[PDB]
Scaffold this active site. Structure first.
Site, mmCIF file in Angstrom:
data_model
loop_
_atom_site.group_PDB
_atom_site.id
_atom_site.type_symbol
_atom_site.label_atom_id
_atom_site.label_comp_id
_atom_site.label_asym_id
_atom_site.label_seq_id
_atom_site.Cartn_x
_atom_site.Cartn_y
_atom_site.Cartn_z
ATOM 1 N N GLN A 19 0.817 -1.203 0.000
ATOM 2 C CA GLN A 19 0.000 0.000 0.000
ATOM 3 C C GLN A 19 0.859 1.266 0.000
ATOM 4 O O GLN A 19 0.367 2.372 -0.260
ATOM 5 C CB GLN A 19 -0.930 -0.016 1.219
ATOM 6 C CG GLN A 19 -0.293 0.200 2.573
ATOM 7 C CD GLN A 19 -1.329 0.141 3.668
ATOM 8 O OE1 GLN A 19 -1.743 1.137 4.255
ATOM 9 N NE2 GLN A 19 -1.861 -1.025 3.983
ATOM 10 N N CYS A 25 -5.294 0.693 3.306
ATOM 11 C CA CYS A 25 -5.508 -0.703 3.721
ATOM 12 C C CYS A 25 -6.938 -1.251 3.539
ATOM 13 O O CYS A 25 -7.135 -2.425 3.210
ATOM 14 C CB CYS A 25 -5.095 -0.865 5.182
ATOM 15 S SG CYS A 25 -6.187 -0.090 6.381
#
Length: 215
Positions: A19, A25
């Protein structure tokens, strides 16, 4: 199905991603779940786009956070059920910013029709996962920056702040555990994965569990 299930050993899980500096997330949890459910519905495992959610889902907040349940409903209600391939809408938010949404120039890789929210009970989440596949969950990840491997037997469990993907469990081990895919590259944890003890709501793993429905 009881005993132990590991969906990575069933060809159902894509490689660990990254990420970066974006607080995305929620999008990696939601798309990882869609990738696995699409495979389990009888289609070839395809990498799908987190960037589509970070950039285009305006019911969540891009690199400032979101919720997997809002992400599933934005795909259905606002994007005609479409989830683009990762190849046609690559991750572009590693530096911490989400570029403007582009609505064309992408290819549909999967479609979903809705989502189900699972009971806040680990034995019931295990029973569903065993048959229907990987589950998106929210956890308290406060302890996780110091995770170096093995089954974590105690976890700080105060505030949900992170979204991940439950890919399996093993009740036959010395301490029963959950197996979880994270989005912080293969350099973290056990090749990007973490195992936490199962049955005592470690890291608040039973509190916000859900899955996309395809079909």
């Amino acid at each position: 199905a009881p005993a132990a299930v590991d969906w990575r050993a069933r060809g159902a899980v894509t490689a660990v991603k990254d990420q970066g500096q974006c607080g995305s997330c929620w999008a990696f949890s939601a798309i990882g779940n869609v990738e696995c459910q699409w495979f389990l519905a009888g289609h070839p495992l395809t990498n799908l786009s987190e960037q589509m959610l970070v950039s285009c889902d305006k019911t969540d907040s891009g690199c400032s956070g979101g919720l997997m349940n809002n992400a599933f409903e934005w795909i259905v209600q606002e994007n005609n059920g479409a989830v683009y391939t990762e190849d046609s809408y690559p991750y572009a938010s590693g530096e911490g910013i989400s570029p403007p949404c582009t609505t064309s120039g992408h290819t549909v890789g999967a479609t979903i029709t809705g989502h189900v929210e699972l009971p806040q009970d680990e034995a019931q989440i295990a029973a569903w996962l065993a048959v229907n596949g990987p589950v998106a969950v929210a956890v308290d990840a406060s302890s996780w920056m110091t995770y170096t491997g093995g089954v974590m037997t105690s976890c700080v469990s105060e505030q949900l702040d992170h979204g991940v993907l439950l890919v399996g469990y093993n009740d036959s081990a010395a301490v029963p555990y959950w197996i979880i895919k994270n989005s912080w590259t293969t350099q973290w944890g056990e090749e990007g994965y973490i195992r936490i003890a199962k049955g005592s709501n470690q890291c608040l793993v039973k509190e916000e569990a859900s899955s996309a429905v395809v079909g």
